[PDB]
Amino acid sequence: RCVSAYLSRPSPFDLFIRKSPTITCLVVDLAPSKGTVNLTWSRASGKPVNHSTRKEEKQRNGTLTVTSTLPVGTRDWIEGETYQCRVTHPHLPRALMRSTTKTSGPRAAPEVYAFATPEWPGSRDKRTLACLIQNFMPEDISVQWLHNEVQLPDARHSTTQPRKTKGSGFFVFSRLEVTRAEWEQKDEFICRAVHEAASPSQTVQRAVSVNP
Amino acid sequence: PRCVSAYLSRPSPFDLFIRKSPTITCLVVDLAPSKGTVNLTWSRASGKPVNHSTRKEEKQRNGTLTVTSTLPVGTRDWIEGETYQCRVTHPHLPRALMRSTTKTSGPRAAPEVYAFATPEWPGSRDKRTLACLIQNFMPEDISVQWLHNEVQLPDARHSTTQPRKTKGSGFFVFSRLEVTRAEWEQKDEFICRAVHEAASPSQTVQRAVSVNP
Numbered sequence: 001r002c003v004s005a006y007l008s009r010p011s012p013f014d015l016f017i018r019k020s021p022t023i024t025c026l027v028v029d030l031a032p033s034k035g036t037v038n039l040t041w042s043r044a045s046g047k048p049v050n051h052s053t054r055k056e057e058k059q060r061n062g063t064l065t066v067t068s069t070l071p072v073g074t075r076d077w078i079e080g081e082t083y084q085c086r087v088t089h090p091h092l093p094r095a096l097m098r099s100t101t102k103t104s105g106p107r108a109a110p111e112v113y114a115f116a117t118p119e120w121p122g123s124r125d126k127r128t129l130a131c132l133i134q135n136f137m138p139e140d141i142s143v144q145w146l147h148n149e150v151q152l153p154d155a156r157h158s159t160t161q162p163r164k165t166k167g168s169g170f171f172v173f174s175r176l177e178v179t180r181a182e183w184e185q186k187d188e189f190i191c192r193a194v195h196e197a198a199s200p201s202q203t204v205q206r207a208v209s210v211n212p
Numbered sequence: 213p214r215c216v217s218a219y220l221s222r223p224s225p226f227d228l229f230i231r232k233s234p235t236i237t238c239l240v241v242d243l244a245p246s247k248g249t250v251n252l253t254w255s256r257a258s259g260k261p262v263n264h265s266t267r268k269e270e271k272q273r274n275g276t277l278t279v280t281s282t283l284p285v286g287t288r289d290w291i292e293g294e295t296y297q298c299r300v301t302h303p304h305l306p307r308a309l310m311r312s313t314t315k316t317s318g319p320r321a322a323p324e325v326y327a328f329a330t331p332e333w334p335g336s337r338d339k340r341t342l343a344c345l346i347q348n349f350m351p352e353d354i355s356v357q358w359l360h361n362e363v364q365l366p367d368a369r370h371s372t373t374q375p376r377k378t379k380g381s382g383f384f385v386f387s388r389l390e391v392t393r394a395e396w397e398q399k400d401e402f403i404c405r406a407v408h409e410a411a412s413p414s415q416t417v418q419r420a421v422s423v424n425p
């Protein structure tokens with residue numbers, strides 16, 4: 001058992017689309033009822049942080065997981081503010097510190113390719129849609145699926161973690177199982193990516209149907 | 213902080229079924245270099261003898277010492293459900309570390325393999341990307357390879373995802389293979405092959421694909 005902490009950047013969707021970005025500090029592998037863990041937010045500039053939301057949940061594995069989500073200013077983030085999570089506990093050797101700021105370096109917009117699986121024996125009342133988004137940088141990307149131009153619940157699909165392409169960019173796969181009911185009432189699906197380098201409006205999408 | 217952790221892998225279905233020379237690997241991460249040596253000890257639950265293992269040490273560009281032991285195992289022994297344990301002996305560790313591994317057991321289900329070529333995208337048109345979705349297999353142990361002209365490419369040429377749960381009972385995986393004009397022009401024949409215990413016969417399922425059919 002080893003307590004670790006993870007500090008996330010805002011989702012490009014939250015940041016560019018909803019324009020209400022948040023960051024999250026995730027603390028894993030805590031021993032329940034060993035008193036409470038303090039999660040403290042701060043800014044490198046020293047300016048005030050918003051009220052954060054804290055979530056605790058005991059895990060099937062006897063772990064305690066704690067998260068704090070902090071809303072951040074769109075301007076502040078995009079302008080390069082640095083945000084720190086500090087994790088405290090009297091029962092804990094040192095204190096834990098993660099920090100986060102907008103990514104740097106060169107940008108490159110995503111290529112988005114969407115594919116339908118051919119009918120495979122057995123369940124023919126199901127197909128799988130898949131999406132390859134690649135050659136973007138930096139690695140921060142949001143993926144979503146739409147049916148009939150309306151966004152599906154995020155739980156409907158699986159998206160992979162950004163892996164390095166053989167070059168300088170990253171790629172990602174998204175998988176979306178669909179039903180006959182769905183593609184029959186309209187065979188229109190969109191894999192949409194949100195990425196800082198996509199112009200304009202940080203969005204790139206690709207349509208795909210079960211039939212060609 | 214810094215957490216020494218240990219990982220014990222099952223044999224690759226390729227090694228196991230195709231090369232019929234399976235191995236397991238114990239990986240120990242986040243060691244403090246020159247804190248003396250870490251012992252990695254192999255054992256079998258049946259108490260029968262273990263082969264000679266290979267040990268690899270490498271300081272990482274992050275200051276971490278990484279240690280691995282690879283143990284060759286009997287095909288029969290594995291498939292018959294022998295259990296193998298890695299024991300990790302070290303000073304900076306209060307409790308010794310123990311991982312164990314055995315063949316998986318539960319519902320079997322063969323993989324569905326679908327292969328796709330990316331359309332020509334502006335910029336580099338001397339490159340395409342092949343992609344493969346393998347899904348609905350169980351258990352999660354799978355090998356993926358790409359062939360061009362019926363000959364297997366170097367594993368480094370492609371990226372394969374980690375098995376994720378499908379919405380159902382099975383797993384899926386994606387493989388990505390960038391190709392060159394030189395390659396698909398001299399023959400536009402590529403195969404995504406999976407090796408999986410549930411695939412019959414001969415534990416193999418593959419699918420062909422080409423740049424602009």
Ligand SMILES: *[C@@H]1O[C@H](CO)[C@@H](O[C@@H]2O[C@H](CO)[C@@H](O[C@@H]3O[C@H](CO[C@H]4O[C@H](CO)[C@@H](O)[C@H](O)[C@@H]4O)[C@@H](O)[C@H](O[C@H]4O[C@H](CO)[C@@H](O)[C@H](O)[C@@H]4O)[C@@H]3O)[C@H](O)[C@H]2NC(C)=O)[C@H](O)[C@H]1NC(C)=O
Pocket residue numbers: 001004006008024028029059060061063065161
């Ligand atoms: C008890 O059981 C729980 C699960 O039920 C385990 O909790 C998990 O713990 C692991 C590791 O300790 C966590 O892994 C880390 O997750 C981070 C975020 O998770 C996802 O969700 C966010 C959005 O909330 C996404 O941004 C992200 O893509 C993930 O989908 C990752 O960011 C971590 O980083 C990984 O990639 C980076 C590359 O930048 C590497 O640096 C890291 O090394 C790593 O590869 C990492 O994946 C996991 O999040 C926890 N699950 C939950 C609840 O989300 C406990 O670990 C378990 N305890 C024991 C003893 O087993």
Ligand SMILES: *[C@@H]1O[C@H](CO)[C@@H](O[C@@H]2O[C@H](CO)[C@@H](O[C@@H]3O[C@H](CO[C@H]4O[C@H](CO)[C@@H](O)[C@H](O)[C@@H]4O)[C@@H](O)[C@H](O[C@H]4O[C@H](CO)[C@@H](O)[C@H](O)[C@@H]4O)[C@@H]3O)[C@H](O)[C@H]2NC(C)=O)[C@H](O)[C@H]1NC(C)=O
Pocket residue numbers: 219221239241272273274276278373374
């Ligand atoms: C300092 O730098 C080193 C060197 O890069 C980092 O070491 C890596 O650390 C991670 C996590 O500790 C190791 O992850 C483990 O890899 C195992 C083997 O992976 C290889 O083989 C598999 C086949 O199983 C391939 O699919 C894969 O692409 C690799 O080729 C996996 O078996 C493990 O998977 C299990 O645990 C992870 C936990 O993250 C889960 O997400 C999985 O679902 C699964 O349960 C595991 O991922 C990695 O191998 C190390 N690299 C090596 C080989 O040295 C240090 O992490 C880094 N320290 C810092 C600063 O973070």
